[PDB]
A paper describes a structure:
The genome of Mtb encodes 13 mycobacterial membrane protein large (MmpL) transporters. These membrane proteins belong to a subfamily of the resistance-nodulation cell division (RND) superfamily of transporters and are critical for mycobacterial physiology and pathogenesis, with several of these transporters involved in the export of fatty acids and lipid components to the cell envelope. MmpL4 and MmpL5 share similar functions in siderophore export and are required for iron acquisition. Mycobacteria secrete mycobactin (Mbt) and carboxymycobactin (Cmb), siderophores with an extremely high affinity for Fe(III), via the MmpL4 and MmpL5 transporters to recruit this important metal that is essential for growth and survival. According to the protein sequence alignment with MmpL3, it is speculated that both MmpL4 and MmpL5 are proton motive force (PMF)-dependent transporters that function via a proton/substrate antiport mechanism.
However, only MmpL5 appears to confer increased resistance to bedaquiline, an FDA approved anti-TB drug. Within the transmembrane domain of the MmpL5 transporter, the conserved residues that make up the proton-relay network are also residues D278, Y279, D851, and Y852.
Residue numbers in the entry:
A (entry chain A): 22 to 494, 693 to 956
B (entry chain B): 2 to 84
Write the structure that this text describes.
């Protein structure tokens, strides 16, 4: 009595395959490609409720000059000191920038105004910068469009001899990051397919079965990318470059892994002397639930990212889960159908090398005879990666994570060749009141606030109405001197209800010291306004330093919450399948332990060998996939253990090793190397996350599954399957005749 | 109380799974490391399966002492008669 589901798949293999390919083609043709959809559906880098963006937006609103929260800086560099022709060029550029109303919202002209010209010019006089407030929050499609428009306006124009204009800033860096990721996705896909083709030829030694698994991989990846593009195009969710890169790589990896699992079980059944129909049914009965649970675990683990706060991690959640579900559905339905329809034709899927697994016999014997020593060695090898924690540091500047020739990087280099980091990252603070603050009393109150901000350590200059160029400037005639009017216009609200300060740190503001100094300035301003008519006022502070402070605050929450959610959900799924609490706990805890080795290898390769420290994003993006895939491999091994345990513990384990040793090792290798294949991307952080996941899965395939979990199972014995009741060894059988 | 022939049949089945050597090649005279080219590790797998399926426990220390099939049967014969 064949089960109804594999029978249905086998009997209607051709209609199922045709329906799958038709649906995939419709998905991939109706909507634009994943590159275009990801470009249109780019999301803002920072949360909409972040204090920094809210402060910048409030400053723009009260001053009625812009509505955005992100700005870029146009740096003018010349071989000789800038003069009259450079000033005319700058004035024309500023006028043209202000002309583009839809993209450019406000241009803060400080160099042109003689009152604050000295602050916008380098001490060598060969450089000058202007802050331009582009439309759209950083990271959005509108922000990228505005960055492109500003770059075109500043660059594509006549220039004085020796004078060049560069556009830099966080928004430009994000735009170039997404551009580089989308450009490198094609190379990533090509290299990944070449690598998996070579390794499938190595592990199968047959071109036909390699083509079959490549067809399954193509179907799964096309379905995943098509459904993600279809849902993104209709604004179901946002997208990032990280989301698309992870979607395509994970789709390829999981499709290859499920194809490897199914074909390996089918070929083992054939090797055990079974006809094609019986072998197919055995393969389904032994692998369908395993691959279903693998897909469910990966999808749910990625979906756990949907409950974080940072937009870049939160956005990645749903698309990854949906792609994971679609690829596991394709592998579960089109997989067996393809396998049957191709095994019906000659020696198509028959095993090529009719060779046993001697080494897996040896390692199974070793792990069931001396579990303690092997377990101790494996635990030590997993924990040896923890000694790299003390030397682990993460940086937040994206300068080194992009190619040295992108326009953002060259603008960054030009700006830092003449200006300090504090100048290029000013911190903006304003005080909002309900009164007209154009009186001498309010004026020296503002002066006192500026002095209080200045007295805080680590602060270099404070620009305001009283100190237009960072230094103090009361004559009643001076209030209408045509210079105080301009200073008030540039530093005070049009209705005079708010006053703006431009705090410039002393040193590097983009660091934890800058984050502490932010609260220091907030406290200093609060103290300054105390006991004054400005007491009933609201204080807003923003800037690049504040934005990175918010990001730093978020990062720990994201890491902890995604790790905990993925852990709990994976453990729940393992309990549901294996029906054993201890086995599920072992499966989860083994990869939890291996995470240390994964992290150690990653920071050994990047921080020390390559020299580029790990980005702050790589670990949260990598832990989820590491846990999911490692738990999947352990689950496959444990399910085979449960299948073979009727012969008794300590021999069912050996049979599980010799049964799912080569296939699972090949799957782990292909997954690890296809994730490492993203190291070819121009965006360094994509390569970092890919290589981190690759090293972690390499360690999981080589150690935590071949040595850790079987030794744990042997040590626990009957208790490994608790609360299920199993015997340590079967009833002693009489010696056969 | 199992006879010598019955133990041979049980061992040969374990031999087939562990190594792949045909049951016919297994006779009490053939040596594990000279004739049957069975390494020490493969002997451990043999002991594990026999201890599980038949209950005869052979520790690691005594495993090196056994050299051919005959003394393995004698070891198993010794264990069952003591009972
Ligand atoms: C392993 C052995 C049976 C002798 O080694 P061998 O079987 O390779 O000839 C004996 O030294 C032993 O029992 N050692 C205890 C565990 C050990 O030494 N190594 C386990 C990892 S291979």
């Amino acid at each position: 009595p064949r089960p109804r589901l594999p029978w249905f798949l086998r009997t209607f293999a051709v209609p199922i395959i045709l329906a799958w390919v038709a649906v995939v083609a419709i998905l991939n043709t109706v909507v634009p490609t994943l590159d275009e959809v990801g470009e249109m559906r780019a999301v803002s880098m920072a949360p909409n409720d972040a204090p920094s963006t809210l402060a910048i937006k409030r400053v723009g609103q009260v001053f009625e000059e812009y509505d955005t929260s992100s700005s870029v800086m146009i740096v003018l560099e010349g071989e000789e000191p800038l003069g009259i022709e450079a000033h005319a060029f700058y004035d024309k550029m500023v006028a043209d920038l202000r002309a583009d109303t839809e993209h450019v919202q406000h241009v803060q002209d400080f160099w042109g105004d003689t009152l604050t010209a000295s602050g916008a010019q380098s001490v060598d006089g060969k450089a000058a910068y202007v802050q331009v407030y582009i439309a759209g929050d950083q990271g959005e499609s509108l922000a990228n469009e505005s960055v492109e428009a500003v770059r075109k306006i500043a660059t594509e124009r006549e220039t004085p001899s020796g004078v060049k204009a560069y556009v830099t800033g966080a928004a430009a860096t994000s735009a170039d990051q997404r551009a580089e990721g989308d450009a490198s996705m094609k190379l990533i896909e090509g290299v990944t397919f070449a690598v998996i083709t070579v390794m499938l030829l190595a592990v199968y030694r047959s071109v036909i079965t390699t083509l079959i698994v490549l067809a399954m991989v193509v179907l799964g990846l096309s379905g995943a990318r098509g459904i993600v593009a279809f849902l993104g195009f209709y604004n179901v969710f946002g997208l990032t470059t990280f989301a698309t890169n992870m979607v395509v790589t994970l789709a390829i990896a999981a499709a290859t892994d499920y194809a490897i699992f199914l074909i390996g079980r089918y070929q083992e059944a054939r090797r055990a002397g079974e006809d094609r129909e019986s072998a197919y049914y055995t393969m389904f009965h032994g692998t369908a639930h395993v691959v279903l649970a693998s897909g469910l675990t990966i999808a749910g683990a990625t979906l756990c990212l949907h409950f974080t706060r940072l937009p870049y991690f939160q956005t990645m959640g749903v698309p990854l889960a949906i792609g994971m579900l679609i690829v596991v559905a394709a592998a579960l339905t089109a997989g067996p159908a393809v396998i049957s329809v191709v095994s019906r034709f000659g020696k198509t899927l028959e095993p090529k090398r009719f060779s046993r697994s001697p080494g897996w016999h040896r390692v199974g014997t070793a792990t069931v005879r001396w579990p303690g020593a092997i377990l101790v060695c494996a635990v030590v090898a997993a924990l040896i990666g923890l000694l790299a924690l003390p030397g682990y540091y993460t940086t937040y500047d994206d300068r080194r994570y992009l190619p040295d020739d992108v326009p953002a990087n060259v603008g960054y280099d030009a700006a830092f060749r003449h200006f300090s980091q504090a100048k290029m990252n000013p911190d903006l603070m304003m005080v909002e009141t309900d009164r007209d603050l154009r009186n001498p009393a309010d004026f020296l109150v503002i002066d006192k606030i500026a002095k209080a901000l200045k007295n805080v350590h680590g602060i270099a200059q404070v620009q305001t109405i009283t100190r237009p160029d960072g230094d103090p400037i009361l004559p009643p005639e001076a209030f209408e001197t045509d210079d105080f009017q301009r200073g008030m216009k540039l530093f005070m609200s049009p209705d005079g209800h708010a006053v703006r300060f431009t705090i410039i740190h002393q040193g590097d503001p983009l660091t934890e010291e800058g984050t502490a100094r932010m609260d220091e300035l907030k406290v200093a301003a609060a103290d300054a306004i105390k006991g004054t008519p400005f007491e009933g006022a609201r204080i807003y502070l923003g800037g690049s330093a504040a934005t990175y402070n918010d990001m730093q605050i978020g990062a720990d929450y994201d890491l902890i919450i995604v790790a905990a959610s993925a852990l709990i959900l994976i453990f729940i799924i393992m309990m549901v399948l294996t029906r054993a609490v201890v086995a599920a706990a072992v499966i989860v805890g083994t990869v939890v332990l291996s995470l240390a080795s994964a992290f150690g290898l990653s920071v050994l390769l990047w921080q020390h060998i390559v020299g580029i420290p790990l980005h702050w994003m790589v670990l949260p993006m990598s832990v989820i996939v590491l846990l999911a895939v490692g738990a999947d491999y352990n689950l496959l091994l444990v399910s085979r253990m449960k299948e073979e345990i009727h012969a008794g513990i300590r021999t069912g384990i050996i049979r599980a090793m010799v049964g799912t040793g080569a296939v699972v090792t090949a799957a782990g290798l292909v997954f690890a190397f296809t994730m490492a294949s993203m190291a070819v991307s121009s965006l360094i952080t994509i390569g970092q996350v890919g290589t981190t996941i690759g090293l972690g899965l390499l360690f999981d395939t080589l150690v935590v599954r071949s040595l850790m979990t079987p030794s744990i199972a042997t040590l626990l014995g009957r208790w490994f399957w608790w609360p299920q009741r199993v015997r340590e060894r079967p009833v002693p059988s009489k010696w056969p005749t | 109380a199992a006879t010598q022939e019955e133990i041979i049949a049980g061992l040969a089945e374990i031999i087939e799974e562990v190594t792949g050597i045909e049951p016919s090649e297994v006779t009490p005279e053939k040596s594990f490391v000279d004739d049957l080219d069975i390494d020490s590790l493969s002997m451990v797998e043999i002991a594990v399966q026999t201890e599980d399926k038949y209950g005869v426990k052979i520790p690691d220390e005594d495993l090196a002492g056994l050299r051919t099939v005959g003394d393995v049967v004698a070891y198993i014969q010794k264990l069952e008669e003591e009972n």
